Design a protein around this ligand. Sequence first.
Ligand code: CLA
Ligand code: CLA
Ligand code: CLA
Ligand SMILES: CC(=O)O[C@H]1CC(C)(C)C(=C=C/C(C)=C/C=C/C(C)=C/C=C/C=C(C)/C=C/C=C(\C)C(=O)C[C@@]23O[C@]2(C)C[C@@H](O)CC3(C)C)[C@](C)(O)C1
Ligand SMILES: CC(=O)O[C@H]1CC(C)(C)C(=C=C/C(C)=C/C=C/C(C)=C/C=C/C=C(C)/C=C/C=C(\C)C(=O)C[C@@]23O[C@]2(C)C[C@@H](O)CC3(C)C)[C@](C)(O)C1
Ligand SMILES: CC(=O)O[C@H]1CC(C)(C)C(=C=C/C(C)=C/C=C/C(C)=C/C=C/C=C(C)/C=C/C=C(\C)C(=O)C[C@@]23O[C@]2(C)C[C@@H](O)CC3(C)C)[C@](C)(O)C1
Ligand code: KC2
Ligand code: KC2
Ligand code: KC2
Lengths: 180, 180, 180
Amino acid sequence: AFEDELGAQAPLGFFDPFGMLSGDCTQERFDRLRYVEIKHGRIAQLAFLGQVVTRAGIHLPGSINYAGDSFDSFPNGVAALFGPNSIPTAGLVQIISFIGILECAFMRDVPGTGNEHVGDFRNGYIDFGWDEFDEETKLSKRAIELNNGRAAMMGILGLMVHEEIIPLGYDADLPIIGHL
Amino acid sequence: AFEDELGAQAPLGFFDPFGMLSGDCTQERFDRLRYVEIKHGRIAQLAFLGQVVTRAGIHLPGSINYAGDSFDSFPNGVAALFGPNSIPTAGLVQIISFIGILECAFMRDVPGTGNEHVGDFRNGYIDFGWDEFDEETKLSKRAIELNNGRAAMMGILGLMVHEEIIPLGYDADLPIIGHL
Amino acid sequence: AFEDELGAQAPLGFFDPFGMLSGDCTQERFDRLRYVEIKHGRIAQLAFLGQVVTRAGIHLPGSINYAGDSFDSFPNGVAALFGPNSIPTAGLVQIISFIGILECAFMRDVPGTGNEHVGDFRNGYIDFGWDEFDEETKLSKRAIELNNGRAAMMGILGLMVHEEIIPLGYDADLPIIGHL
Ligand code: CLA
Ligand code: CLA
Ligand code: CLA
Ligand SMILES: CC(=O)O[C@H]1CC(C)(C)C(=C=C/C(C)=C/C=C/C(C)=C/C=C/C=C(C)/C=C/C=C(\C)C(=O)C[C@@]23O[C@]2(C)C[C@@H](O)CC3(C)C)[C@](C)(O)C1
Ligand SMILES: CC(=O)O[C@H]1CC(C)(C)C(=C=C/C(C)=C/C=C/C(C)=C/C=C/C=C(C)/C=C/C=C(\C)C(=O)C[C@@]23O[C@]2(C)C[C@@H](O)CC3(C)C)[C@](C)(O)C1
Ligand SMILES: CC(=O)O[C@H]1CC(C)(C)C(=C=C/C(C)=C/C=C/C(C)=C/C=C/C=C(C)/C=C/C=C(\C)C(=O)C[C@@]23O[C@]2(C)C[C@@H](O)CC3(C)C)[C@](C)(O)C1
Ligand code: KC2
Ligand code: KC2
Ligand code: KC2
């Protein structure tokens, strides 16, 4: 039933190993799964962009504290949030609070606003020209977003794992990025 | 749609900053939110009453243990539940178990019993004369309960925060209640 | 309404102390409760069987690690999973991952497959002859499964509690099984 939905493309086609959509799956279940997948993909895309920017030597100009702790002095990766040399716990809690405010008020599907598909948070408020695209281009953009999100999920998991296995003696000369 | 419901009164009117009810919000969502708000308000009202009674020097007569630990020897506030001089862990676990029994059996909206609104746990079992009040008086009582609950939420949050910031050097001469 | 459902047997009859099905309880709520009860019963039956087999001196032949840690060297009970002499954390995490894979993909009620009642995971895939039984025998088998599951819930709780109270000085010469 969902073998022709978004995300079922070449070369794998419809790829449902664990069988979430097996049987007479309801549209609500697939909508929930696609919402979770798109949310994870967007978060992972942002996380991968952040690690790429930070690890390349690009840091915000200034100090993260009144104490003078410069932005470009903190480590990259999980060591920047959780560790002995991480950013202050106040900064992490404020970041989490901002993300929670976004979750509750901003990055949500408001019913009866004009949203067209799962993951559309536009809400008739912030539109950059979605209606300019025709249907085929719209589907292509949605598929690109979803697949880049899956790739970012895998990449961010790999980056965190590789950073975490370095103290254990598992230091890998990763391609392109190099040593973490 | 919910701008004329209970709790939207002077001077703020309908106050929905985070936009929980924005858009075509369903009645189920508002009922869930109002249930959570009323439950929190009742819990916080009881918590503030407990704070006032305990901090005023009124303690239960006797001892909380067979070992002879008197009721009036334990501290007030968070130090009475979680701390080195708190009540015995068995007492806290029994309190939590009693509250869970209440949650699962007593303080619940039993369907098909005669409940009139969200937060009405009466269940046609314990009534002190609710039907004696007229509709306007009923609405006034419900609004009083809700607003006192919100005030108690903020007050209990303030009391816990002020108790917790005292060891950090943030001791404030609070009005009325004084030093915690 | 649910006083004649499965699980209401002599001598207790319909036993609903906490009043979970009191009032106009929907079939969905009873179905959820029965699903949870059957799942817990099956898990507890497996846990009791495994703990009895392990405590009887029957262990898998070989070693659980490449390091040579034999199966019959680990303790019995909670000390085998969580403790200073437990199985390796890798083994526990892999067991949890296998159970999660089962939860997600295998031990589930796939809609539109032919399942006849709550707790039926057969899904028209693995059938040993369920249709051979008549209606009364089917009800008897389901009731036996449910009641043995409740008995196993109590038994596994008792086994874990008795194992945990031994270091505290509460060592009980339990009947049949003896000292844990
Ligand atoms: C998962 C996302 C994520 C997370 C958790 C972090 C976390 C962190 N970043 Mg970071 N970053 C990210 C994405 C992320 N970043 C992206 C995508 C970029 C590229 C622009 C950067 C660029 C960046 C720089 C240049 C620096 C950091 C730094 C830091 C650290 C200090 C916090 C700070 O100043 O943030 C700053 C965050 C930003 C500048 C960009 C955040 C953008 C977010 C993800 C937007 C997402 C919500 C957005 C409002 C949605 C808009 C919707 C639209 C319709 C309006 C902290 C560990 C600093 C550091 O290393 O100090 C220790 C630092 O110097 N980051
Ligand atoms: C959030 C609610 C709450 C919580 C968590 C606590 C927690 C505590 N209180 Mg306390 N207390 C509360 C509310 C609360 N109280 C209220 C509202 C009052 C005013 C009557 C008191 C009066 C009070 C005294 C006088 C003493 C305590 C003490 C204590 C401590 C020991 C436990 C004990 O003996 O409880 C005793 C609890 C009570 C005497 C009253 C509890 C009543 C609860 C809130 C009823 C709520 C559910 C109820 C069944 C609903 C009925 C619905 C109706 C339709 C039937 C413990 C830290 C003792 C202490 O400090 O020793 C260490 C102590 O001496 N409390
Ligand atoms: C709650 C269930 C449960 C749990 C958590 C454990 C946990 C454990 N068992 Mg164990 N065991 C169980 C049930 C369980 N067992 C049952 C039911 C039996 C009887 C066959 C055994 C027999 C057994 C032996 C003989 C040994 C262990 C050992 C161990 C320990 C090492 C892990 C291992 O080798 O597993 C091995 C697990 C098994 C041999 C059987 C597990 C079978 C599971 C329960 C199947 C459940 C799902 C299944 C696929 C459903 C199929 C449905 C069907 C339609 C296809 C570990 C603490 C070993 C030990 O103590 O070394 C430290 C050991 O030597 N167990
Ligand atoms: C004005 C304003 O405020 O906002 C607007 C601005 C604008 C532009 C309109 C908006 C937008 C669009 C945005 C932000 C789009 C972002 C898209 C983004 C960020 C897309 C890539 C993600 C990451 C991927 C694919 C990672 C793959 C990672 C992969 C495939 C790996 O496995 C990788 C790997 O590393 C390992 C682990 C090991 C090494 O071998 C190295 C490599 C690399 C191989 C917003 C959102 O509307 C907000
Ligand atoms: C027979 C039996 O068993 O039961 C029946 C008995 C009976 C009577 C019928 C029943 C009832 C009704 C009850 C229990 C009603 C209770 C109502 C209650 C308990 C109502 C106030 C709450 C707290 C508020 C408003 C706090 C505000 C706190 C505020 C506004 C603050 O911010 C405060 C502040 O402190 C700071 C943090 C700093 C300092 O500057 C000091 C102050 C104070 C300014 C029940 C429930 O049906 C059960
Ligand atoms: C081919 C393949 O791969 O799979 C198939 C194989 C097969 C056979 C078809 C299948 C099956 C059926 C199975 C596995 C059925 C299992 C049934 C099972 C395991 C049934 C008892 C549970 C435990 C009870 C009742 C415990 C009570 C415990 C009680 C009553 C206590 O309180 C006890 C106690 O200890 C205390 C705490 C203290 C002491 O005084 C000692 C005692 C004992 C008194 C499956 C599932 O379809 C999978
Ligand atoms: C996530 C987004 C975000 C938002 C929306 C946001 C809003 C506000 C507002 C509201 C207008 C104020 C008034 C405010 C004030 C301060 N912020 Mg924010 N802040 C955010 C993020 C961070 C991070 C990451 C850090 C940080 C800090 C500080 C410090 C320094 C305190 C000090 O130096 O003792 C002060 C005074 C740093 C800190 O925590 O220092 C321990 C630091 O690391 N903030 N901040
Ligand atoms: C929340 C409500 C509540 C209920 C409904 C409830 C019911 C019962 C019943 C059932 C009829 C019994 C039989 C019972 C028995 C004991 N209770 Mg309760 N008890 C409640 C609350 C507390 C608190 C707060 C404490 C406490 C204690 C004890 C001790 C002392 C043990 C000891 O001194 O070794 C014993 C023997 C104290 C304790 O935990 O001491 C470590 C203590 O702090 N109990 N209790
Ligand atoms: C729950 C079911 C389950 C499944 C489905 C499953 C699948 C696979 C697969 C996939 C085909 C591989 C390739 C694989 C391989 C290894 N397993 Mg499994 N394994 C399961 C259970 C356990 C347990 C309980 C233990 C264990 C272990 C090891 C070790 C030893 C590593 C070492 O000696 O360093 C290796 C190499 C032991 C261990 O973790 O040792 C620290 C141990 O305790 N495994 N295992």
